[PDB]
Amino acid sequence: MYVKLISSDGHEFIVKREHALTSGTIKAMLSTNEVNFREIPSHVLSKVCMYFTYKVRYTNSSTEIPEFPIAPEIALELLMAANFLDC
Template identity: 40%
Template sequence: MDQDVEMPDKGAELAEDWVCMTSPDGFTFLVKGKVAVVSGTLKNSLTSGLEESQTKLIVMTERGVVAGKLVEYLAHKSIYEKEGATDIPDFAERVAPEIALELLMAADYYEV
């Protein structure tokens, strides 16, 4: 007698989890899993067999001000990424010129 065994959907589980993201200068951000997986890099880390998938802790290399703006953008993108969304506010207006280059490099690394 064969029984179909359903494998848990890691993406669905992760959507309900919280992810802790820390910067080297001591800032910590708690992010809903469904927001974190907007980033391709974070999604891969959190759904693979890596330590991050168990601990839900992401240690970032970006300083806190950049990490905070990246987290803010992930939330912005998760809200406005829906198909057919209109009146999407321009996020660039919320980025200080002093961190623009660092944020661009972080966005590239995190695939957002």
Template identity: 40%
Template sequence: MDAETPNTTQFVKLVSAEGSEFYIDRNVAVSASKTLRTMLEGQFREAKDNVIRLPEISNYILERILQYLYYQTKYSNSTGRVPEFPIEPEIALELLIASKYLDC
């Protein structure tokens, strides 16, 4: 990356416990998760690298969380019909812990 390239990319990358990579829209990340916003807008290494490691969140949970971030972004100001966001009972606890950590 040369010096002229701005550090702010349109997307950011999240890395799960298993090392899988999820690319999400930066605006969705900062508007739907306070934790991600703090990481991406503060003086953290994450803000420079555009990569956030989440070693405590497994693939399946992270994918569901990210679906939720997009769902929240899409429907937060919506006055129309909001579809349900289904959560399988067997992941409810893990999802709750992860969403608490990400503050979303």
């Protein structure tokens, strides 16, 4: 039910397995219950996990969807990780 995503700097993020299987790349690195991301630091990986909760919450709900915030200071590293994970 939960899996552990580990950032390049050793922070451990524990998210629901369904939220993590939203990434095809993560599904493959599990297909074990831990994934080590040698290239993604914790200020990026935390945003990735916030995005999982946001997507699962707001896909197919037609209320009003708020904007997903991205601070400029992290935008480029986040893009690099999103590109690699096909998030």
